[PDB]
Amino acid sequence: AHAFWSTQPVPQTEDETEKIVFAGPMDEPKTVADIPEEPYPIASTFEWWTPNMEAADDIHAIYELLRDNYVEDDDSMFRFNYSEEFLQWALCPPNYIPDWHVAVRRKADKKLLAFIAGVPVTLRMGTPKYMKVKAQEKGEGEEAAKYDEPRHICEINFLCVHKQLREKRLAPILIKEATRRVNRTNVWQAVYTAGVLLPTPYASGQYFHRSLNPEKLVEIRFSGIPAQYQKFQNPMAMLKRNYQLPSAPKNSGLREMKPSDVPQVRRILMNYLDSFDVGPVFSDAEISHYLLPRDGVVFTYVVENDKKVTDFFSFYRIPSTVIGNSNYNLLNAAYVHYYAATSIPLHQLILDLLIVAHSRGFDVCNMVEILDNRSFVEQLKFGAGDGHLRYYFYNWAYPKIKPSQVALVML
Ligand SMILES: CCCCCCCCCCCCCC(=O)SCCNC(=O)CCNC(=O)[C@H](O)C(C)(C)COP(=O)(O)OP(=O)(O)OC[C@H]1O[C@@H](n2cnc3c(N)ncnc32)[C@H](O)[C@@H]1OP(=O)(O)O
Ligand SMILES: CCN(CC)Cc1cccc(-c2cc(Cl)c(S(=O)(=O)Nc3c(C)nn(C)c3C)c(Cl)c2)c1
């Protein structure tokens, strides 16, 4: 049983999600005036806080909570170490609503105890193509297309409760208060991901990893040495050779994205993202924010030929604290962000990603099997990992889709 999730406008079982045919809301329609204006009650030793995302010391405070208390692997060997710069970037996109950043502090000393963050996203989330087809056969086209237009909704990330405060039901309260603040801005849907199984995902995808620095990955035990590499003399030289990469990209006309590329990148990205059932819609400003390079945070390259941007790729950095080793403090991981190819095969574009990530000192490259990420797995030597990223809507009935019909990257 789910004492909290059973009370919420989400599908409640796998069975329920498989019978859904049309996209649409679940809840009673409400209005801003229906929503309580006062924050949800919490115990008297705690207070609600709205962090200022431009205050270095507020960012710092959130940074520390997440450094010590955020997502770990199942064997507690790694914990995410999102940087302060990464957090300002993720939390403060264009037109972000400060009130959507929800923190609980200890009233006495103002120690931060819990955090949840919401940012705006414009998302296509209408009935998926296959169901739309089936609806025409059945005569229900107008029903299937009712919510086809991109919607301005909330993207929830960064939910974290301090380890000292776990299992005290503080997360339900955080989610209720975030929901209140979002509803009071006339927004009624949300999208979120989790590694855990909650009621109920509309999509699920496995994680994939590409060793860039296998000696380190083996030392820290992210990776194992293959059983077949044992029947060799010095297996470490063999593993290194297996994963080796050119020192420089193979596409002539690859360079870093610059501000003037914004319109062309937006155009080729939107064309590509348009073919997926679930995907974001970006303005020029959002393309600038989410894709222009920032030191230590986001790395973006375009292929330009004849003065035309024909392809691009992006990746971003999230180091993980290595909990148990001594020789190493950090895993430096690059994550496949957005991309688009028109002039070359995807596998050839993404090799350049690997090449750049490797020469800049990253240890591994990570991705979930959304977009067309599967198309390059075998040739670029990515392996499936333990992780499964699940995708969820709050207050939105949506049929079950393959992860290759998802075009939304979560930070
Ligand atoms: C329209 C606007 C709507 C906006 C809201 C949209 C929904 C937002 C949803 C949030 C999207 C988050 C997206 C991400 O960031 S997912 C990443 C979540 N973060 C972490 O895992 C960091 C490390 N862990 C922790 O900090 C805590 O253990 C957390 C905070 C995760 C749980 O704290 P704690 O261990 O102290 O437990 P509790 O006693 O307070 O509460 C127990 C209840 O919480 C349910 N639970 C456990 N894990 C999750 C989870 N990842 N999403 C949603 N619910 C979760 C659980 O089923 C139970 O409910 P029920 O089973 O009794 O019913
Ligand atoms: C990214 C956070 N949010 C995005 C919104 C999603 C999310 C949520 C839940 C779990 C995952 C996830 C991610 C990765 Cl990248 C891996 S991993 O690489 O192999 N191993 C690993 C390492 C190196 N460090 N950590 C901390 C772990 C878990 C694994 Cl298991 C799980 C991701």
Short mmCIF file of C-alpha atoms and ligand atoms in Angstrom, two decimals:
data_model
loop_
_atom_site.label_atom_id
_atom_site.label_comp_id
_atom_site.label_asym_id
_atom_site.label_seq_id
_atom_site.Cartn_x
_atom_site.Cartn_y
_atom_site.Cartn_z
CA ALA A 1 0.00 0.00 0.00
CA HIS A 2 1.06 3.58 -0.55
CA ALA A 3 -0.29 5.72 2.30
CA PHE A 4 0.63 8.86 0.33
CA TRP A 5 0.51 7.93 -3.39
CA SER A 6 -2.90 6.25 -3.06
CA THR A 7 -4.28 9.76 -2.24
CA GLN A 8 -2.93 11.38 -5.42
CA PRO A 9 -4.13 11.93 -8.99
CA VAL A 10 -1.79 9.35 -10.57
CA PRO A 11 -2.47 5.91 -12.05
CA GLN A 12 -2.32 3.38 -9.18
CA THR A 13 -1.38 0.06 -10.85
CA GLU A 14 0.41 -1.21 -13.99
CA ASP A 15 -2.96 -2.59 -15.03
CA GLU A 16 -4.57 0.90 -14.92
CA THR A 17 -1.79 2.39 -17.15
CA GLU A 18 -2.09 -0.34 -19.81
CA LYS A 19 -5.83 0.28 -20.34
CA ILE A 20 -5.38 4.09 -20.84
CA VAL A 21 -5.83 5.20 -24.46
CA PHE A 22 -6.16 9.01 -24.42
CA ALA A 23 -3.98 11.68 -22.86
CA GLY A 24 -5.78 13.87 -20.34
CA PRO A 25 -6.03 15.08 -16.74
CA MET A 26 -7.10 12.79 -13.89
CA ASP A 27 -8.23 15.23 -11.23
CA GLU A 28 -11.38 17.33 -10.76
CA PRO A 29 -10.88 20.61 -12.65
CA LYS A 30 -9.92 23.31 -10.17
CA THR A 31 -9.02 26.96 -10.12
CA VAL A 32 -6.35 29.04 -8.44
CA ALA A 33 -9.01 30.45 -6.07
CA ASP A 34 -9.77 26.85 -4.92
CA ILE A 35 -6.16 26.44 -3.79
CA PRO A 36 -5.15 27.30 -0.23
CA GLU A 37 -3.12 30.53 -0.14
CA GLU A 38 -1.29 29.54 3.02
CA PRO A 39 1.58 27.10 3.12
CA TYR A 40 0.91 23.62 4.28
CA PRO A 41 1.30 23.18 8.07
CA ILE A 42 4.57 21.72 9.37
CA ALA A 43 5.84 21.15 12.93
CA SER A 44 6.84 24.24 14.94
CA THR A 45 10.62 23.54 14.98
CA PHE A 46 10.67 23.68 11.16
CA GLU A 47 9.90 26.46 8.64
CA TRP A 48 9.27 26.67 4.88
CA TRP A 49 11.99 28.52 2.97
CA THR A 50 12.26 29.87 -0.58
CA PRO A 51 15.99 29.84 -1.54
CA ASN A 52 17.29 32.72 -3.61
CA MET A 53 18.95 30.98 -6.55
CA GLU A 54 21.24 33.95 -7.26
CA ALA A 55 22.51 34.07 -3.67
CA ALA A 56 25.82 32.15 -3.72
CA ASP A 57 25.29 31.15 -0.12
CA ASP A 58 21.74 29.82 -0.78
CA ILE A 59 23.08 27.78 -3.74
CA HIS A 60 25.89 26.65 -1.43
CA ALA A 61 23.39 25.46 1.19
CA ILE A 62 21.42 23.38 -1.33
CA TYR A 63 24.73 22.12 -2.76
CA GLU A 64 25.75 20.73 0.62
CA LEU A 65 22.44 19.03 1.28
CA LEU A 66 22.69 17.22 -2.06
CA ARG A 67 26.42 16.47 -1.72
CA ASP A 68 25.78 14.61 1.53
CA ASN A 69 22.24 13.33 1.10
CA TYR A 70 21.23 12.91 -2.56
CA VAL A 71 20.97 9.76 -4.77
CA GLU A 72 23.40 6.89 -4.09
CA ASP A 73 23.89 3.60 -5.91
CA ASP A 74 22.33 0.49 -4.33
CA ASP A 75 25.68 -0.55 -2.83
CA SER A 76 26.41 2.94 -1.53
CA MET A 77 29.78 3.32 -3.31
CA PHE A 78 28.78 6.48 -5.25
CA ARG A 79 26.70 9.62 -4.48
CA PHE A 80 25.97 12.45 -6.94
CA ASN A 81 27.99 15.61 -6.46
CA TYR A 82 26.18 18.21 -8.58
CA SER A 83 28.30 21.41 -8.55
CA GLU A 84 26.99 24.87 -7.41
CA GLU A 85 27.28 26.13 -11.01
CA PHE A 86 25.35 23.11 -12.29
CA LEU A 87 22.61 23.87 -9.74
CA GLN A 88 22.25 27.54 -10.66
CA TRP A 89 22.06 26.42 -14.31
CA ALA A 90 19.46 23.66 -13.67
CA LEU A 91 17.32 25.61 -11.21
CA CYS A 92 17.26 28.99 -12.98
CA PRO A 93 16.16 28.59 -16.62
CA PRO A 94 14.29 31.40 -18.49
CA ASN A 95 10.99 32.45 -16.84
CA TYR A 96 11.64 30.22 -13.79
CA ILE A 97 9.31 30.74 -10.84
CA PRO A 98 11.32 31.29 -7.63
CA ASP A 99 8.37 30.06 -5.51
CA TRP A 100 8.76 26.63 -7.15
CA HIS A 101 11.94 26.02 -5.15
CA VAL A 102 10.73 24.57 -1.86
CA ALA A 103 12.96 24.00 1.17
CA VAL A 104 12.39 23.03 4.82
CA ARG A 105 14.80 24.53 7.39
CA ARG A 106 15.24 23.88 11.08
CA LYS A 107 13.79 27.05 12.67
CA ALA A 108 16.47 27.32 15.38
CA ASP A 109 19.76 27.19 13.37
CA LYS A 110 18.39 27.32 9.77
CA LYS A 111 20.03 24.00 8.89
CA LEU A 112 18.49 22.87 5.58
CA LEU A 113 16.70 19.55 6.05
CA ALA A 114 14.82 18.95 2.83
CA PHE A 115 14.56 20.32 -0.70
CA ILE A 116 12.41 19.91 -3.80
CA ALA A 117 12.61 21.91 -7.02
CA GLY A 118 10.22 22.64 -9.88
CA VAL A 119 11.02 24.44 -13.11
CA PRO A 120 8.78 25.32 -16.06
CA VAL A 121 8.81 23.20 -19.18
CA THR A 122 6.73 23.44 -22.35
CA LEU A 123 5.94 19.81 -23.13
CA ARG A 124 4.22 17.94 -25.95
CA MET A 125 2.27 15.24 -24.09
CA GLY A 126 -0.76 14.54 -26.28
CA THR A 127 -1.98 11.09 -27.27
CA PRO A 128 0.92 9.12 -28.80
CA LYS A 129 0.90 8.49 -32.58
CA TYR A 130 0.01 4.77 -32.48
CA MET A 131 -3.04 5.33 -30.21
CA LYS A 132 -4.08 8.30 -32.40
CA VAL A 133 -4.13 5.96 -35.41
CA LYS A 134 -6.22 3.40 -33.48
CA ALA A 135 -8.60 6.22 -32.52
CA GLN A 136 -9.27 7.10 -36.18
CA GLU A 137 -10.18 3.48 -36.87
CA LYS A 138 -12.67 3.69 -33.94
CA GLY A 139 -14.05 7.18 -34.87
CA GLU A 140 -12.63 9.05 -31.81
CA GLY A 141 -10.10 11.36 -33.52
CA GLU A 142 -11.24 14.60 -31.85
CA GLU A 143 -11.03 12.93 -28.44
CA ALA A 144 -7.53 11.62 -29.17
CA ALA A 145 -6.34 15.06 -30.28
CA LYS A 146 -7.96 17.18 -27.49
CA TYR A 147 -4.63 17.87 -25.69
CA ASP A 148 -2.22 17.88 -28.66
CA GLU A 149 -0.96 21.38 -28.02
CA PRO A 150 2.27 21.81 -26.00
CA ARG A 151 1.49 22.54 -22.34
CA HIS A 152 3.27 24.73 -19.81
CA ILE A 153 3.78 22.38 -16.89
CA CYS A 154 6.18 21.75 -14.01
CA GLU A 155 9.35 19.66 -14.16
CA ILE A 156 10.21 18.34 -10.71
CA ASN A 157 13.79 17.46 -9.75
CA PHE A 158 16.14 17.33 -6.77
CA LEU A 159 13.88 15.89 -4.06
CA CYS A 160 16.05 15.23 -1.04
CA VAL A 161 15.53 14.63 2.70
CA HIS A 162 18.55 14.81 5.03
CA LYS A 163 19.62 11.32 6.16
CA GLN A 164 18.93 12.16 9.82
CA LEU A 165 15.29 12.85 8.91
CA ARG A 166 14.40 9.85 6.70
CA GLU A 167 11.18 7.84 7.11
CA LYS A 168 9.53 10.61 9.11
CA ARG A 169 7.01 11.22 6.26
CA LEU A 170 8.61 14.58 5.37
CA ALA A 171 8.62 13.82 1.59
CA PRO A 172 4.80 13.63 1.27
CA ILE A 173 4.64 17.12 2.90
CA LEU A 174 7.29 18.53 0.56
CA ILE A 175 5.40 17.18 -2.43
CA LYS A 176 2.03 18.60 -1.18
CA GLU A 177 3.58 22.05 -0.64
CA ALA A 178 5.33 22.05 -4.06
CA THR A 179 1.98 21.00 -5.60
CA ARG A 180 0.19 23.91 -3.81
CA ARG A 181 2.72 26.51 -5.05
CA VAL A 182 2.50 25.14 -8.63
CA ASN A 183 -1.32 25.00 -8.63
CA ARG A 184 -1.44 28.63 -7.35
CA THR A 185 0.33 29.60 -10.58
CA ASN A 186 -2.49 27.87 -12.54
CA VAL A 187 -0.35 24.81 -13.42
CA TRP A 188 -1.89 21.37 -12.86
CA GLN A 189 0.44 18.76 -14.43
CA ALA A 190 4.01 17.82 -13.65
CA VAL A 191 6.68 15.55 -15.09
CA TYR A 192 9.33 13.73 -13.04
CA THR A 193 11.75 10.81 -13.18
CA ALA A 194 13.06 8.46 -10.52
CA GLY A 195 15.26 5.38 -10.33
CA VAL A 196 12.67 3.83 -8.05
CA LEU A 197 9.32 2.24 -8.96
CA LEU A 198 6.39 4.43 -7.97
CA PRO A 199 2.81 4.49 -9.19
CA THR A 200 2.97 4.57 -12.14
CA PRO A 201 5.51 5.10 -14.95
CA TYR A 202 4.39 5.83 -18.50
CA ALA A 203 7.89 4.88 -19.71
CA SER A 204 11.02 3.10 -18.50
CA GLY A 205 14.55 2.95 -19.78
CA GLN A 206 17.79 1.30 -18.85
CA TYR A 207 21.05 3.21 -18.29
CA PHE A 208 24.06 2.72 -20.57
CA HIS A 209 27.74 3.52 -19.93
CA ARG A 210 30.81 4.01 -22.13
CA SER A 211 34.19 3.66 -20.44
CA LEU A 212 36.56 6.47 -21.22
CA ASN A 213 39.05 5.79 -18.44
CA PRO A 214 38.71 2.07 -17.58
CA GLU A 215 41.76 1.82 -15.28
CA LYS A 216 40.03 4.26 -12.87
CA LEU A 217 36.58 2.72 -13.38
CA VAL A 218 37.96 -0.71 -12.42
CA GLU A 219 39.89 0.70 -9.45
CA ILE A 220 36.79 2.43 -8.01
CA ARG A 221 34.68 -0.64 -8.97
CA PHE A 222 32.24 1.11 -11.26
CA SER A 223 33.41 -1.52 -13.76
CA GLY A 224 34.62 -5.11 -13.59
CA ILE A 225 37.36 -6.84 -15.60
CA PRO A 226 35.72 -9.20 -18.16
CA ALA A 227 36.02 -12.91 -17.30
CA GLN A 228 37.46 -13.48 -20.80
CA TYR A 229 40.15 -10.81 -20.28
CA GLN A 230 41.49 -13.02 -17.45
CA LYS A 231 42.78 -15.70 -19.88
CA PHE A 232 45.26 -12.95 -20.96
CA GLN A 233 48.71 -11.80 -19.71
CA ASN A 234 48.28 -8.14 -18.56
CA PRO A 235 44.44 -7.53 -18.92
CA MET A 236 44.64 -3.81 -18.04
CA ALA A 237 46.55 -2.93 -21.23
CA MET A 238 43.94 -4.95 -23.18
CA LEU A 239 41.00 -3.12 -21.57
CA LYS A 240 42.67 0.25 -22.20
CA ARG A 241 43.29 -0.72 -25.85
CA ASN A 242 39.71 -1.86 -26.21
CA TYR A 243 38.31 1.55 -25.15
CA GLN A 244 40.95 3.85 -26.72
CA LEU A 245 39.85 6.92 -28.65
CA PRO A 246 41.34 9.43 -31.08
CA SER A 247 42.71 12.55 -29.44
CA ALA A 248 40.79 14.76 -31.88
CA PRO A 249 37.27 14.65 -33.43
CA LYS A 250 36.82 13.10 -36.90
CA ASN A 251 34.28 15.56 -38.31
CA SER A 252 35.91 18.50 -40.06
CA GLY A 253 33.73 21.46 -39.23
CA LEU A 254 33.17 20.52 -35.60
CA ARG A 255 33.55 23.48 -33.25
CA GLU A 256 31.93 24.78 -30.05
CA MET A 257 28.45 26.24 -30.22
CA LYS A 258 28.36 30.06 -30.09
CA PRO A 259 25.45 32.49 -29.41
CA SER A 260 24.87 33.04 -33.17
CA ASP A 261 24.14 29.30 -33.69
CA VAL A 262 21.00 29.54 -31.47
CA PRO A 263 18.39 29.86 -34.26
CA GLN A 264 19.80 27.00 -36.40
CA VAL A 265 20.30 24.66 -33.40
CA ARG A 266 16.72 25.35 -32.27
CA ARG A 267 15.39 24.60 -35.78
CA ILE A 268 17.25 21.30 -36.24
CA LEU A 269 16.53 20.23 -32.63
CA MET A 270 12.78 20.97 -32.92
CA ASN A 271 12.55 19.09 -36.24
CA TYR A 272 14.14 16.05 -34.59
CA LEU A 273 12.30 16.25 -31.21
CA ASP A 274 8.99 16.68 -33.10
CA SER A 275 9.03 13.01 -34.17
CA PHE A 276 8.77 11.70 -30.55
CA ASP A 277 5.52 11.30 -28.61
CA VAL A 278 6.74 13.09 -25.47
CA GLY A 279 9.18 15.98 -25.87
CA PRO A 280 10.09 19.54 -24.90
CA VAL A 281 9.52 22.70 -26.97
CA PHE A 282 12.29 25.29 -26.55
CA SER A 283 12.39 29.03 -27.29
CA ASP A 284 15.58 30.78 -28.49
CA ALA A 285 16.20 31.81 -24.86
CA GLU A 286 15.85 28.19 -23.61
CA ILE A 287 18.15 26.91 -26.34
CA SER A 288 20.69 29.54 -25.24
CA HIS A 289 20.28 28.62 -21.57
CA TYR A 290 20.29 24.81 -21.89
CA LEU A 291 22.85 24.42 -24.68
CA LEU A 292 25.41 27.31 -24.84
CA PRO A 293 28.67 26.04 -23.27
CA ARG A 294 29.36 26.85 -19.57
CA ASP A 295 32.71 25.89 -18.00
CA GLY A 296 32.46 22.68 -15.95
CA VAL A 297 28.72 22.31 -16.70
CA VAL A 298 27.55 21.94 -20.35
CA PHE A 299 29.58 21.25 -23.50
CA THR A 300 28.05 21.75 -26.93
CA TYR A 301 29.44 21.32 -30.40
CA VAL A 302 27.99 21.94 -33.80
CA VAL A 303 28.94 20.64 -37.23
CA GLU A 304 29.12 23.62 -39.56
CA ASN A 305 29.62 23.30 -43.26
CA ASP A 306 29.24 25.95 -45.94
CA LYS A 307 28.40 28.32 -43.04
CA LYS A 308 25.35 26.13 -42.17
CA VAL A 309 24.95 24.28 -38.87
CA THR A 310 23.96 20.79 -40.01
CA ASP A 311 24.43 18.74 -36.79
CA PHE A 312 25.10 19.21 -33.09
CA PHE A 313 25.64 17.31 -29.85
CA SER A 314 25.69 18.34 -26.18
CA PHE A 315 26.79 16.72 -22.93
CA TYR A 316 26.81 17.87 -19.28
CA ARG A 317 28.91 16.98 -16.22
CA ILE A 318 27.87 15.43 -12.95
CA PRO A 319 30.69 14.19 -10.78
CA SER A 320 29.94 11.46 -8.23
CA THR A 321 31.63 11.25 -4.88
CA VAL A 322 33.45 7.95 -4.56
CA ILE A 323 32.47 6.88 -1.07
CA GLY A 324 34.67 3.89 -0.24
CA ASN A 325 38.01 4.20 -2.12
CA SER A 326 41.11 6.13 -0.90
CA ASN A 327 43.16 6.75 -4.12
CA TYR A 328 40.17 8.56 -5.74
CA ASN A 329 37.67 11.19 -4.52
CA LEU A 330 35.49 11.67 -7.62
CA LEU A 331 34.04 9.95 -10.66
CA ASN A 332 33.91 12.52 -13.48
CA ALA A 333 30.89 11.55 -15.64
CA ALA A 334 29.59 13.08 -18.90
CA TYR A 335 25.90 12.62 -19.74
CA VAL A 336 24.51 12.60 -23.28
CA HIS A 337 22.23 15.68 -23.48
CA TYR A 338 20.35 16.79 -26.65
CA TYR A 339 21.63 16.30 -30.18
CA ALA A 340 20.56 16.18 -33.80
CA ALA A 341 22.16 14.77 -36.98
CA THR A 342 21.19 15.56 -40.61
CA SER A 343 24.42 15.10 -42.66
CA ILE A 344 26.11 12.15 -40.96
CA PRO A 345 25.09 8.94 -39.21
CA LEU A 346 24.29 9.37 -35.49
CA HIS A 347 27.05 6.91 -34.51
CA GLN A 348 29.60 9.13 -36.26
CA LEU A 349 28.34 12.30 -34.56
CA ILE A 350 28.36 10.66 -31.11
CA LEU A 351 31.89 9.24 -31.50
CA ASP A 352 33.03 12.87 -31.60
CA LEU A 353 31.14 13.36 -28.27
CA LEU A 354 33.09 10.46 -26.73
CA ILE A 355 36.34 11.84 -28.19
CA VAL A 356 35.78 15.33 -26.74
CA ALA A 357 34.59 13.99 -23.35
CA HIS A 358 37.68 11.79 -23.15
CA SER A 359 40.18 14.53 -24.02
CA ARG A 360 38.61 16.84 -21.40
CA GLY A 361 39.23 14.28 -18.61
CA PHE A 362 35.83 12.57 -18.18
CA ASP A 363 35.92 8.95 -16.94
CA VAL A 364 32.69 7.54 -18.45
CA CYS A 365 29.84 8.67 -20.64
CA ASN A 366 26.28 7.94 -19.49
CA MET A 367 22.85 7.95 -21.09
CA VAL A 368 19.38 6.46 -20.85
CA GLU A 369 17.91 4.67 -23.91
CA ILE A 370 15.56 7.59 -24.82
CA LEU A 371 15.77 9.45 -28.18
CA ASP A 372 17.74 7.33 -30.73
CA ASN A 373 20.37 6.46 -28.10
CA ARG A 374 20.01 2.68 -28.83
CA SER A 375 21.10 3.19 -32.45
CA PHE A 376 24.74 3.72 -31.45
CA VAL A 377 25.21 1.41 -28.40
CA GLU A 378 26.99 -1.55 -29.97
CA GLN A 379 29.31 0.34 -32.28
CA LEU A 380 30.44 2.89 -29.70
CA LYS A 381 30.91 0.16 -27.08
CA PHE A 382 28.30 1.29 -24.50
CA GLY A 383 27.16 -1.41 -22.05
CA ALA A 384 23.82 -1.61 -20.20
CA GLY A 385 24.07 -0.78 -16.47
CA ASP A 386 22.04 -1.57 -13.33
CA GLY A 387 19.98 1.61 -13.40
CA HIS A 388 16.50 2.08 -14.77
CA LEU A 389 15.15 5.59 -15.20
CA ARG A 390 11.33 5.77 -14.95
CA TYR A 391 9.23 8.64 -16.29
CA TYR A 392 6.04 9.84 -14.59
CA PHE A 393 3.27 12.37 -14.97
CA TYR A 394 1.43 13.94 -12.05
CA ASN A 395 -2.30 14.42 -12.85
CA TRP A 396 -2.05 13.16 -16.43
CA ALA A 397 -3.44 9.92 -17.87
CA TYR A 398 -1.02 8.68 -20.49
CA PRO A 399 -0.63 5.27 -22.18
CA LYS A 400 2.49 3.16 -21.72
CA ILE A 401 5.16 3.97 -24.35
CA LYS A 402 8.62 2.71 -25.27
CA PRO A 403 11.50 4.84 -23.96
CA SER A 404 12.57 5.41 -27.60
CA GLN A 405 9.40 7.48 -27.90
CA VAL A 406 10.71 9.91 -25.20
CA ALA A 407 12.64 13.05 -26.12
CA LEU A 408 12.87 14.74 -22.68
CA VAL A 409 16.30 14.73 -20.98
CA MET A 410 16.19 15.26 -17.18
CA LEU A 411 19.16 16.84 -15.41
C1 LIG B 1 1.13 19.88 -10.46
C2 LIG B 1 2.40 19.98 -9.62
C3 LIG B 1 2.73 18.64 -8.97
C4 LIG B 1 4.16 18.61 -8.42
C5 LIG B 1 4.45 17.30 -7.69
C6 LIG B 1 4.62 16.15 -8.68
C7 LIG B 1 5.09 14.88 -7.95
C8 LIG B 1 6.50 15.00 -7.39
C9 LIG B 1 7.01 13.62 -6.94
C10 LIG B 1 8.48 13.68 -6.53
C11 LIG B 1 9.39 13.35 -7.72
C12 LIG B 1 10.84 13.24 -7.24
C13 LIG B 1 11.82 13.14 -8.41
C14 LIG B 1 13.19 12.86 -7.85
O1 LIG B 1 13.89 13.80 -7.52
S1 LIG B 1 13.76 11.28 -7.66
C15 LIG B 1 15.21 11.38 -6.65
C16 LIG B 1 14.71 11.35 -5.21
N1 LIG B 1 15.82 11.63 -4.32
C17 LIG B 1 16.57 10.74 -3.65
O2 LIG B 1 16.39 9.53 -3.74
C18 LIG B 1 17.67 11.28 -2.75
C19 LIG B 1 17.99 10.30 -1.59
N2 LIG B 1 16.74 9.98 -0.88
C20 LIG B 1 16.05 10.83 -0.14
O3 LIG B 1 16.43 11.98 0.02
C21 LIG B 1 14.77 10.37 0.54
O4 LIG B 1 14.78 8.96 0.84
C22 LIG B 1 13.51 10.74 -0.25
C23 LIG B 1 13.28 12.25 -0.21
C24 LIG B 1 13.59 10.29 -1.72
C25 LIG B 1 12.31 10.02 0.40
O5 LIG B 1 12.16 10.39 1.76
P1 LIG B 1 12.07 9.34 2.99
O6 LIG B 1 12.82 8.08 2.63
O7 LIG B 1 12.43 10.10 4.22
O8 LIG B 1 10.52 8.85 3.02
P2 LIG B 1 9.30 9.61 3.76
O9 LIG B 1 8.90 8.79 4.96
O10 LIG B 1 9.64 11.06 3.97
O11 LIG B 1 8.12 9.45 2.69
C26 LIG B 1 7.72 8.17 2.23
C27 LIG B 1 6.94 8.35 0.93
O12 LIG B 1 7.73 8.91 -0.15
C28 LIG B 1 7.62 8.06 -1.29
N3 LIG B 1 8.88 8.14 -2.07
C29 LIG B 1 10.07 7.57 -1.80
N4 LIG B 1 10.95 7.93 -2.76
C30 LIG B 1 10.30 8.74 -3.63
C31 LIG B 1 10.64 9.41 -4.80
N5 LIG B 1 11.88 9.34 -5.32
N6 LIG B 1 9.72 10.17 -5.43
C32 LIG B 1 8.48 10.28 -4.97
N7 LIG B 1 8.12 9.64 -3.86
C33 LIG B 1 9.00 8.87 -3.17
C34 LIG B 1 7.31 6.67 -0.75
O13 LIG B 1 6.64 5.84 -1.72
C35 LIG B 1 6.43 7.01 0.45
O14 LIG B 1 5.07 7.23 0.07
P3 LIG B 1 3.97 6.05 0.22
O15 LIG B 1 4.54 4.85 -0.51
O16 LIG B 1 3.84 5.92 1.74
O17 LIG B 1 2.76 6.53 -0.54
C1 LIG B 2 20.64 11.46 -12.55
C2 LIG B 2 19.69 11.70 -11.43
N1 LIG B 2 18.34 11.61 -11.92
C3 LIG B 2 18.24 12.43 -13.11
C4 LIG B 2 17.03 13.28 -12.99
C5 LIG B 2 18.01 10.28 -12.37
C6 LIG B 2 18.40 9.07 -11.61
C7 LIG B 2 17.74 8.67 -10.61
C8 LIG B 2 18.05 7.61 -9.99
C9 LIG B 2 19.13 6.83 -10.38
C10 LIG B 2 19.83 7.17 -11.52
C11 LIG B 2 21.08 6.48 -11.89
C12 LIG B 2 22.04 7.17 -12.57
C13 LIG B 2 23.26 6.63 -12.84
CL1 LIG B 2 24.31 7.62 -13.81
C14 LIG B 2 23.63 5.36 -12.42
S1 LIG B 2 25.11 4.78 -12.59
O1 LIG B 2 25.96 5.52 -13.35
O2 LIG B 2 25.32 3.48 -12.76
N2 LIG B 2 25.79 4.77 -11.13
C15 LIG B 2 25.86 5.79 -10.23
C16 LIG B 2 26.93 6.61 -10.18
C17 LIG B 2 28.20 6.59 -10.97
N3 LIG B 2 26.68 7.49 -9.27
N4 LIG B 2 25.46 7.22 -8.78
C18 LIG B 2 25.09 8.16 -7.73
C19 LIG B 2 24.92 6.16 -9.30
C20 LIG B 2 23.57 5.64 -8.94
C21 LIG B 2 22.66 4.72 -11.68
CL2 LIG B 2 22.90 3.10 -11.07
C22 LIG B 2 21.44 5.26 -11.41
C23 LIG B 2 19.47 8.36 -12.06
#
